[PDB]
Design a protein around this nucleic acid. Structure first.
Ligand SMILES: [Mg+2]
Ligand SMILES: [Mg+2]
Ligand SMILES: [Mg+2]
Ligand SMILES: [Mg+2]
Ligand SMILES: [Mg+2]
Ligand SMILES: [Mg+2]
Ligand SMILES: [Mg+2]
Ligand SMILES: [Mg+2]
Ligand SMILES: [Mg+2]
Ligand SMILES: [Mg+2]
Ligand SMILES: [Mg+2]
Ligand SMILES: [Mg+2]
Ligand SMILES: [Mg+2]
Ligand SMILES: [Mg+2]
Ligand SMILES: [Mg+2]
Ligand SMILES: [Mg+2]
Ligand SMILES: [Mg+2]
Ligand SMILES: [Mg+2]
Ligand SMILES: [Mg+2]
Ligand SMILES: [Mg+2]
Ligand SMILES: [Mg+2]
Ligand SMILES: [Mg+2]
Ligand SMILES: [Mg+2]
Ligand SMILES: [Mg+2]
Ligand SMILES: [Mg+2]
Ligand SMILES: [Mg+2]
Ligand SMILES: [Mg+2]
Ligand SMILES: [Mg+2]
Ligand SMILES: [Mg+2]
Ligand SMILES: [Mg+2]
Ligand SMILES: [Mg+2]
Ligand SMILES: [Mg+2]
Ligand SMILES: [Mg+2]
Ligand SMILES: [Mg+2]
Ligand SMILES: [Mg+2]
Ligand SMILES: [Mg+2]
Ligand SMILES: [Mg+2]
Ligand SMILES: [Mg+2]
Ligand SMILES: [Mg+2]
Ligand SMILES: [Mg+2]
Ligand SMILES: [Mg+2]
Ligand SMILES: [Mg+2]
Ligand SMILES: [Mg+2]
Ligand SMILES: [Mg+2]
Ligand SMILES: [Mg+2]
Ligand SMILES: [Mg+2]
Ligand SMILES: [Mg+2]
Ligand SMILES: [Mg+2]
Ligand SMILES: [Mg+2]
Ligand SMILES: [Mg+2]
Ligand SMILES: [Mg+2]
Ligand SMILES: [Mg+2]
Ligand SMILES: [Mg+2]
Ligand SMILES: [Mg+2]
Ligand SMILES: [Mg+2]
Ligand SMILES: [Mg+2]
Ligand SMILES: [Mg+2]
Ligand SMILES: [Mg+2]
Ligand SMILES: [Mg+2]
Ligand SMILES: [Mg+2]
Ligand SMILES: [Mg+2]
Ligand SMILES: [Mg+2]
Ligand SMILES: [Mg+2]
Ligand SMILES: [Mg+2]
Ligand SMILES: [Mg+2]
Ligand SMILES: [Mg+2]
Ligand SMILES: [Mg+2]
Ligand SMILES: [Mg+2]
Ligand SMILES: [Mg+2]
Ligand SMILES: [Mg+2]
Ligand SMILES: [Mg+2]
Ligand SMILES: [Mg+2]
Ligand SMILES: [Mg+2]
Ligand SMILES: [Mg+2]
Ligand SMILES: [Mg+2]
Ligand SMILES: [Mg+2]
Ligand SMILES: [Mg+2]
Ligand SMILES: [Mg+2]
Ligand SMILES: [Mg+2]
Ligand SMILES: [Mg+2]
Ligand SMILES: [Mg+2]
Ligand SMILES: [Mg+2]
Ligand SMILES: [Mg+2]
Ligand SMILES: [Mg+2]
Ligand SMILES: [Zn+2]
Lengths: 71, 96, 62, 48
RNA sequence: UCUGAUCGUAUUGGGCAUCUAACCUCGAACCCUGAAUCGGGUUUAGGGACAGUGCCUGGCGGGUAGUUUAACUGGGGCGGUUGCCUCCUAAAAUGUAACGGAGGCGCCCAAAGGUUCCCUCAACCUGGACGGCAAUCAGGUGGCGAGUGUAAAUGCACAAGGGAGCUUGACUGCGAGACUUACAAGUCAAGCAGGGACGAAAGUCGGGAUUAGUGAUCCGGCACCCCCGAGUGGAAGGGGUG
RNA sequence: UUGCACUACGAGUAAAGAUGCUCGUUACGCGCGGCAGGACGAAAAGACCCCGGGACCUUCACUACAACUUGGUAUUGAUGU
RNA sequence: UACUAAAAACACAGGUCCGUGCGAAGUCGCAAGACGAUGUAUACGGACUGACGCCUGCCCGGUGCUGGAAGGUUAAGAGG
RNA sequence: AUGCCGUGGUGUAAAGCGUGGCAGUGAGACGGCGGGGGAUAAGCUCCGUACGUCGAAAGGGAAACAGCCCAGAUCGCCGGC
RNA sequence: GGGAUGAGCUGUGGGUAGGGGUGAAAGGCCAAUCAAACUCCGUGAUAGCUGGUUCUCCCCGAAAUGCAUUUAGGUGCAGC
RNA sequence: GCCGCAGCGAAAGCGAGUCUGAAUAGGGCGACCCACACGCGCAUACGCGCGUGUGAAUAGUGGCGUGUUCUGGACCCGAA
RNA sequence: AAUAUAUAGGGUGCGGGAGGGAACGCGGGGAAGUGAAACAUCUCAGUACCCGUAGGAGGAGAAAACAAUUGUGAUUCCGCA
């Protein structure tokens, strides 16, 4: 025993109601623990960035937890 | 730095060489010329060093920043592109 | 006695027209086959020295 | 077993890309149609 | 006519033998010398182009010399460990120690990448030649218990899982804005242009379901651009880009 | 040798073994001869151990050098095969 | 082991092996020179054992030492 | 439950942020609460805690008694709570 | 107490000198010093280590954590 | 002579721009005042650029102090 | 002289040298500690020290020099660069 890897600092970076700029990183994650909504792109390593300015809004989309941005 | 590779050793050297044979020009702008010679007339390198707009014993290049209105007769080295246009529009000449 | 500047520091840093100190970036000399163009383009260019290193690099340059 | 190979443009011979392959699964030089920055279009490339 | 073998001059090189004159002799005699087992000179007896020595060069060389020989650590030594990835400890944001509890990595894939289109598994029940608990077939039931290149976690049935057609974006020039962070690093990125792939189009494509598969700077190598070129023209050398 | 001084004991407390702190107990002031339980008594900036530096020693640790040794060339020539 | 160790330690006569053919080997010296030795293998130097008696077995794979030169590798020089 | 991010009100002088000059520190200790190692021992050991105190804090209480309770010494007073 | 005609003891004179001497060998001795003497000079050697560092008042006032480290009782940057 | 007086670029070079780049694409570094009026395309207004003032704000350098720092023994004392 | 030419050597007569001195000069030989947070290249440093040899100074000095399309015109030393 004795080994470990580095903490990867995952998690939600912008919570509901926050006003973001285009390109903000919203969620660092493995897999789609959250799914992208409107104006949200996913990213190569499942990063859920913002495509437009606006306010972050979390919701449910028939089983999936999604992140959206309202203009 | 305590034994880790220091900042002056873990960074790459800046690229390129330095030209051993490079020529440097002392510069003056047409705005400065207009400010310093409101009456116009001939404008030589000796006149420029006397007015203090340029260092002495150096090659002088004229650049084209500012507004030039006075009719002047500038003699220098290596005029700029804009400097020639501004001088000739004002109505003078630019000899080398 | 006249003050001497640091040779390696003067080879790795330089100043701009407003006094900013700039540097190149590491990891871009070899082993470039497995590095994507995104990473290589990020490592390209020059950047301003970090605020937590500016004092020591200034002391090295002066 | 998986060496680094470099692909050169057929026309201008510029060494444009470097990549890897399995020498046993591919005992012969690769041909790919990559973009050549010199020629400015897509050209065939081959190992060196 | 490879002319392999052979002729006569050259030329010189290589041994081999002999010679003497360089050089050598702590062999002998004489003189300087009156007192000299020093020294030098003369003659003779031998050796001899060798040896010795100079410069260049390979070996050998604890005989001598200068030094190095890590850290962590319930004292030190012995044992173990040192970088990266995943989980628990970790106290429902992030982060968190111990010689705390468990595992992997130092690759693989020319398709296991891109795109378009189609499909649903494992298990169980019944029937059926070899055939059986389990190969292939048929019909039921089955919402994910299968699978995912490879550890674990988070995901994925809308499929990221299974099959097929065509392809090389496993691009070049960039990159607003972010995450993380002592620094150095590391990570994501809409979108613009060139030139392309697939698609009727909408569109997707800057490798792979994601996170490991790696090493700063220095100093060099290679290809390309033709940037500098120690009086000038070249060149050497340097520079830039990969 | 010496920071002091009109320098008790018990059970405690406290850098966890107290003349000097607590609560009690005991003790007229000052000398002389003795004893050696304490003052973690004196003497020596612990020799043990660890950390840093050194010195000397060893060797199939590294890199060197003397010595010994190889060949070439100069000193160095002649004649034959 | 002057100044905490006198011993079972060292030496010793005796033994064996190796070297040395002669300004020898070996040692002190850059060298000259010196000692060895005014000696000459029954001599000198080094190594180990340690009066005397009876004895001293097997292994030459490893590392040394001695000899050899068929083959492999290998410097400067020559050649260009 | 707490804690964390954002936002709108209200409150609060000696908050916060950027940029420079000059630092020191990088041996922590105990107590409360949540855990690992340990025998669910240690005045043990290793972490968490917009928790406290000591460190660097005197005064009062706890017999004495760094770290527990109360309370933060500008100086004076033969005043009071 | 041991030797006390011997490998004896002793006087006078002389020789060997520091990575050197001498040593019937203990790392012994070489001027009360020896696992490399002493003196002067390099020299005010160096020491991440110990100690010391001298008058006053007023204002503010910590840290004993993170990262890295031939690093762990040192240092650099951040935190304060 | 030094510093200030123009920067960008590896450099040739160009220059209020320059480098990269096919790019009149985007970025890097560097320049560039409006609290205001006049004329001007201009909006309900806010002003966008040009010449002046309504009067718009720059700046460096030499000496002397002080704090820190560099090279020197470098705050003082101390080895083997 | 050996030995013939002669030379080595020997006799005579004239001159000179030797040694000292605080620093400074020129030529030659040439450390280590220390710094590199270890160390060998490197540094310390051509320093300390040593050897030879001066003079009032010494050394250098009259282009087989620089420069670069113009040109300067022996050397030395000082300030810049
Ligand atoms: Mg983790
Ligand atoms: Mg390169
Ligand atoms: Mg690339
Ligand atoms: Mg194949
Ligand atoms: Mg010879
Ligand atoms: Mg020879
Ligand atoms: Mg040796
Ligand atoms: Mg040694
Ligand atoms: Mg040394
Ligand atoms: Mg240790
Ligand atoms: Mg232990
Ligand atoms: Mg956790
Ligand atoms: Mg957490
Ligand atoms: Mg929590
Ligand atoms: Mg492992
Ligand atoms: Mg796939
Ligand atoms: Mg699929
Ligand atoms: Mg396909
Ligand atoms: Mg690739
Ligand atoms: Mg960017
Ligand atoms: Mg396109
Ligand atoms: Mg894209
Ligand atoms: Mg990827
Ligand atoms: Mg994978
Ligand atoms: Mg290096
Ligand atoms: Mg030329
Ligand atoms: Mg070239
Ligand atoms: Mg580029
Ligand atoms: Mg007690
Ligand atoms: Mg008591
Ligand atoms: Mg008492
Ligand atoms: Mg009292
Ligand atoms: Mg008494
Ligand atoms: Mg007593
Ligand atoms: Mg007594
Ligand atoms: Mg004592
Ligand atoms: Mg001590
Ligand atoms: Mg010891
Ligand atoms: Mg004794
Ligand atoms: Mg006895
Ligand atoms: Mg005795
Ligand atoms: Mg003995
Ligand atoms: Mg001999
Ligand atoms: Mg014999
Ligand atoms: Mg023997
Ligand atoms: Mg014996
Ligand atoms: Mg014997
Ligand atoms: Mg015996
Ligand atoms: Mg035997
Ligand atoms: Mg054997
Ligand atoms: Mg043998
Ligand atoms: Mg044999
Ligand atoms: Mg042999
Ligand atoms: Mg500050
Ligand atoms: Mg520390
Ligand atoms: Mg600590
Ligand atoms: Mg607890
Ligand atoms: Mg516990
Ligand atoms: Mg404790
Ligand atoms: Mg402790
Ligand atoms: Mg606690
Ligand atoms: Mg303290
Ligand atoms: Mg108190
Ligand atoms: Mg406080
Ligand atoms: Mg109190
Ligand atoms: Mg107060
Ligand atoms: Mg004597
Ligand atoms: Mg011993
Ligand atoms: Mg003595
Ligand atoms: Mg000595
Ligand atoms: Mg010594
Ligand atoms: Mg010195
Ligand atoms: Mg205060
Ligand atoms: Mg290191
Ligand atoms: Mg520049
Ligand atoms: Mg631009
Ligand atoms: Mg001023
Ligand atoms: Mg005669
Ligand atoms: Mg004299
Ligand atoms: Mg040295
Ligand atoms: Mg050092
Ligand atoms: Mg040191
Ligand atoms: Mg004189
Ligand atoms: Mg002279
Ligand atoms: Zn091409």
């Amino acid at each position: 025993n004795g080994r470990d890897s580095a903490a990867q600092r995952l998690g939600v970076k912008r919570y509901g109601g926050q006003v973001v700029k285009a390109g903000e990183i919203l969620v660092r994650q493995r897999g789609t623990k959250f799914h992208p909504g409107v104006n949200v792109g996913r990213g190569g390593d499942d990063t859920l960035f913002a495509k437009t300015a606006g306010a972050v809004e979390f919701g449910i989309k028939r089983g999936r937890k999604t992140v959206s941005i309202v203009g | 730095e305590g034994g880790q590779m220091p900042i002056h050793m873990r960074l790459p050297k800046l690229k390129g060489f330095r030209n051993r044979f490079r020529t440097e020009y002392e510069i003056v702008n047409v705005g400065d010329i207009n400010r310093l010679f409101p009456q116009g007339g001939a404008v030589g390198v000796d006149d420029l060093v006397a007015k203090g707009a340029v260092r002495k014993n150096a090659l002088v290049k004229v650049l084209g920043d500012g507004k030039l209105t006075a009719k002047v007769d500038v003699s220098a080295h290596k005029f700029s592109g804009s400097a020639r246009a501004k001088i000739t529009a004002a109505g003078g000449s630019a000899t080398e | 006695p006249k003050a001497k500047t640091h040779s390696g520091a003067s080879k790795r840093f330089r100043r701009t027209g407003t006094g900013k100190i700039v540097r190149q970036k590491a990891n871009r000399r070899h082993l470039l086959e497995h590095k994507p163009s995104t990473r290589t383009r990020r490592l390209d260019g020059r950047t301003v020295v970090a605020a937590n290193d500016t004092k020591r690099v200034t002391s090295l340059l002066n | 077993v998986r060496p680094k190979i470099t692909l050169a443009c057929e026309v201008c011979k510029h060494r444009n890309y470097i990549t890897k392959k399995n020498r046993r699964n591919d005992p012969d030089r690769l041909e790919l149609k990559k973009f050549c920055p010199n020629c400015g279009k897509h050209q065939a490339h081959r190992e060196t």
